[PDB]
From a paper:
Focused refinement of particles harboring a [name]-[name] molecule at the active site resolved two substrate binding poses, interpreted as proofreading and inserted states. In the second ‘proofreading’ [name]-[name] binding pose resolved in our dataset, the ligand’s nucleotide and donor sugar moieties are less deeply inserted into the catalytic pocket. The uracil moiety is shifted by about 1.5 Å towards the entrance of the catalytic pocket, resulting in the rotation of His174 away from Tyr91. Further, the nucleotide’s ribose moiety is tilted away from the DxD motif, which places the attached diphosphate group also closer to the binding cleft’s entrance. In this position, the diphosphate is suitably positioned to contribute to cation coordination at the second metal binding site, together with Asp203 and Glu93. The partial insertion of [name]-[name] in the proofreading pose further allows Asp201 of the DxD motif to move away from its binding partner Lys177 to interact with the ribose’s C2 and C3 hydroxyl groups. The ammonium group of Lys177, instead, moves towards the donor sugar and, together with the guanidinium group of Arg341, sandwiches [name]’s carboxylate group. Most notably, while the entire backbone is well resolved in the inserted [name]-[name] bound pose, the density of the conserved Gly300 is essentially absent in the proofreading state, suggesting that this residue and parts of the preceding priming loop are flexible until [name]-[name] is fully inserted into the catalytic pocket. The proofreading pose, in which the carboxylate is recognized between positively charged residues, may serve to distinguish [name]-[name] from [name]-Glc, which is the more abundant metabolite.
Author numbering:
A (entry chain B): 1 to 124
B (entry chain A): 38 to 450, 472 to 552
C (entry chain C): 1 to 121
Write the structure that this text describes.
């Protein structure tokens, strides 16, 4: 059992960072693969980023040069950094975790634990 | 990070092995020319075979004397046999000799070492006779000093061939072990291949291949520079010109005070190498011996051998001054023998404390590949195809020689020597449990996780099929040495 | 123990060719000296030729270059080939074994051989 709490949101001009930070309380956070999803007003939370327990990083399309991911195992957190934001990114951001999983890391049906909400709006 | 420590370990272990392989090949090519430039009917050195023993398997003590009597060599002067201890238990060790050679079973009242007059006439005025001495026992040192004294007073004896009681020399063993003493004037001792005939146990076969890889490679590389660090325990030929001089400081030794006697062979070789002389090793001097089977007995044997090594590798290092340029090898070999064990310990500690699947599967695979290469060379040299059992020698090493090394280091200053071994086993088990319960997750989408799991599964499958091959071979009686296949027949009828 | 049985010999005239075999029952140990001893009519045993079972060759005077040894070492038998026989070369031949037990010293004395065969011719 791991509790996920996410933070970081607000108005920001196109070209800001507005790093998001999701922390996790659990027995051993370093074995949990983590992922970041983008709940848009539509399209039902497209996959955005992820990183396994062995630091390997997976990124969605057209976000390769804009999103950066990492982990903090001392203070359990993910701390997703952002660069060169766009008005198309105005959406909630969600934090998901996994311990036992298969080869389908891009679907919400695989991850077991879930966060609450990281709404972010980008101005013109 | 782990690359400096995995790749450097692989290179450190494999480069020296390749160097030793090429040096052994050079030595074999050197000895073949000597053997070729030799008349067929060659008798020049009058040897005197020396046997020392203590309750050594009445049948096998028969096989040893029979092999020495069946050995082909024109010029054998006599046979000096010394039997430790006098009791109605060693009388039925003199009798097995008396039924092979003659009735000259003497019994000097005092040990020729503690006796004042160290010279001959130990109830022995007969030089043209085959003698057997029954004396009070004080170790192989005291029972071999008697033999050295016996086969010295004859001015027509110029070399002495030492054997152990449970050995079965081939016919052309003495002939090919005494020749290098006549090949060069700076050679005062020759080693000899000491094969193992008992390979009906899993511990008795990997150690057999360890004996092969520690003689025909390790002790062959040193002979190229004529600085063999330890003559063969069971089989070995010594020049009387050096025995007559080194017998006095050999059995006088004090290390730190209290005088104790173990690892006498390496002491003889060390005293030969501390006088600036050269020692070579010939692979055409095959001799057979048995091996310990119980794990505890093997650990005890290896802790005695490690005790012997830890006090005289210092002297082998310090005597490299006497030897010339060839002799930097004598320092490099000792430095390697130290830092390799230290590096293995450090590697285990690192990959057991900093748990990482990709930093453990990689080490396991690299170690397995290196051992496979070594076993492949052993198979090519021996033309045996049973040498691929050497892949499992790593387990025997890690679980028996390392506790022996730690115990010898601790005693250098049940619970006497087995507590450290039990603690080491418990520590390895605790490290394994911690590693397996720490990384308790399954992530098939991760390529690194897939590589780690696939590697560990393939290694487990490889070990399992090797063990199954061994079991099948034991079932069909395929591991049995051709010698053992005949001793097990001569044992039934007797 | 080791029983030696020798065969051969017969009519001898002028320079003849003969071949005497000696078969051994037991173990010879490749360190024991096997020799051919000669006993002339009404005369003491004489020596003809010895050989170690490991392949050492020796002979005696008045027969060197005339007789030759050959140990099979596989059939547990020896064969002595005789060339250019003499009328004075009439006697009974024994094959004897000397064990290198008390000593590895090669001796020509007939009393140093433990086991003896049976005379032929
Ligand atoms: O370090 C040693 O002394 C020997 O120990 C073992 O010898 P092994 O014959 O395999 O085993 P054990 O049953 O311990 O016999 C030790 C040998 O040392 C000698 N010994 C030992 C003990 C004793 O009281 N008296 C004695 O003469 C005998 O030759 C005996 O064969 C090793 O196998 C040999 O390589 C080594 O040379
Ligand atoms: C918790 C369960 C799984 C039982 C515990 C067993 C493992 C923790 C042990 C069994 C085999 C061991 C390995 C066996 C051999 C080696 C070789 C060793 O390197 C060598 O000693 C090779 C040197 C040479 O080739 O001579 C490094 C540790 C390692 C990987 C050992 C690490 C610990 C292992 C995996
Ligand atoms: Mn024994």
């Amino acid at each position: 059992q791991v509790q996920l709490v996410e933070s970081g949101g607000g108005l920001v001009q196109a070209g800001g960072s507005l790093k998001v930070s999701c922390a996790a309380s659990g027995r051993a956070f370093k074995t949990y693969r983590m992922a970041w999803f983008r709940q848009a007003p539509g399209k039902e939370r497209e996959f955005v980023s992820g990183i396994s327990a062995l630091e390997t990083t997976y990124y969605a399309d057209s976000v390769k040069g804009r999103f950066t991911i990492s982990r903090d195992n001392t203070k359990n957190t993910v701390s997703l950094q952002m660069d060169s934001l766009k008005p198309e990114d105005t959406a909630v951001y969600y934090c998901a975790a996994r311990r036992y999983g298969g080869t389908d890391y891009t679907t919400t049906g695989s991850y077991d634990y879930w966060g609450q909400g990281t709404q972010v709006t980008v101005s013109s | 990070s782990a690359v400096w420590g995995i790749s450097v370990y692989g290179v450190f272990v494999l480069g020296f092995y390749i160097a030793q392989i090429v040096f052994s090949e050079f030595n074999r090519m050197r000895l073949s020319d000597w053997i070729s430039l030799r008349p067929d009917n060659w008798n020049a050195t009058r040897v005197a075979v020396i046997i020392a023993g203590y309750r050594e398997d009445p049948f096998m003590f028969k096989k040893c004397l029979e092999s020495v009597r069946d050995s082909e060599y024109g010029n054998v002067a006599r046979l000096i046999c010394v039997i430790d201890g006098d009791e109605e238990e060693d009388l039925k060790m003199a009798e097995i000799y008396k039924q092979v050679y003659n009735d000259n079973v003497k019994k000097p009242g005092v040990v020729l070492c503690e006796s004042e007059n160290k010279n001959g006439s130990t109830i022995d005025s007969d030089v043209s006779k085959n003698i057997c001495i029954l004396q009070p026992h004080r170790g192989k040192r005291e029972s071999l000093y008697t033999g050295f004294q016996l086969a010295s007073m004859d001015p027509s004896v110029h070399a002495v061939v030492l054997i152990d009681s449970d050995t079965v020399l081939e016919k052309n063993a003495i002939l090919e072990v005494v020749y290098p003493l006549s090949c060069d004037p700076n050679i005062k001792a020759v080693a000899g291949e000491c094969k193992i005939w008992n390979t009906d146990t899993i511990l008795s076969m990997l150690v057999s291949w360890r004996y092969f890889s520690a003689f025909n490679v390790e002790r062959g590389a040193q002979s190229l520079w004529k600085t063999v660090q330890c003559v063969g325990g069971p089989l070995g030929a010594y020049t009387i010109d050096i025995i007559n001089e080194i017998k006095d400081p050999w059995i006088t030794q004090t290390f730190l005070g209290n005088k104790c006697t173990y690892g006498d062979n390496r002491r003889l070789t060390n005293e030969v190498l501390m006088r600036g002389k050269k020692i070579v090793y010939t692979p055409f001097a095959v001799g057979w011996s048995d091996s310990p089977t119980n794990v505890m007995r093997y650990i005890v044997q290896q802790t005695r051998w490690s005790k012997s090594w830890c006090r005289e590798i210092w002297y082998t290092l310090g005597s490299a001054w006497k030897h010339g340029f060839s002799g930097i090898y004598l320092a490099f070999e000792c430095m390697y023998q130290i830092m390799y064990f230290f590096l293995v310990m450090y590697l285990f500690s690192y990959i057991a404390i900093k748990a990482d699947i990709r930093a453990q599967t990689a080490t396991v695979l690299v170690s397995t590949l290196v051992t496979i290469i070594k076993s492949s060379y052993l198979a090519l040299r021996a033309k045996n195809l049973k040498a691929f059992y050497f892949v499992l020698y790593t387990y025997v090493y890690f679980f028996c020689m390392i506790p022996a090394r730690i115990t010898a280091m601790f005693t250098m200053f049940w619970a006497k020597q087995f507590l450290i071994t039990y603690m080491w086993w418990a520590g390895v088990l605790a490290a394994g449990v911690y590693s397996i319960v720490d990384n308790w997750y399954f992530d098939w989408a991760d390529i690194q996780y897939r590589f780690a799991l696939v590697g560990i599964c393939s290694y487990l499958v490889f070990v399992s099929i090797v063990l199954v091959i061994y079991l099948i071979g034991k079932i069909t009686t395929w591991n049995y040495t051709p010698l053992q296949k005949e001793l097990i027949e001569e044992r039934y009828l007797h | 123990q080791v029983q030696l049985v020798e065969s051969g010999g017969g009519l001898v005239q002028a320079g003849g060719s003969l071949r005497l075999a000696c078969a051994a029952s037991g173990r010879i140990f490749s360190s024991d000296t096997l020799a051919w001893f000669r006993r002339a009519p009404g005369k003491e045993r004489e020596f003809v030729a010895a050989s170690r079972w490991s392949g050492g060759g020796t002979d005696y005077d008045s027969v060197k270059g005339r007789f030759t040894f050959s140990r099979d070492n596989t059939f547990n038998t020896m064969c002595l080939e005789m060339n250019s026989l003499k009328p004075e070369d009439t006697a009974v031949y024994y094959c004897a074994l000397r064990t290198a037990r008390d000593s590895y010293y090669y001796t020509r004395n007939p009393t140093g051989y433990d086991y003896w065969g049976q005379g032929t011719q």
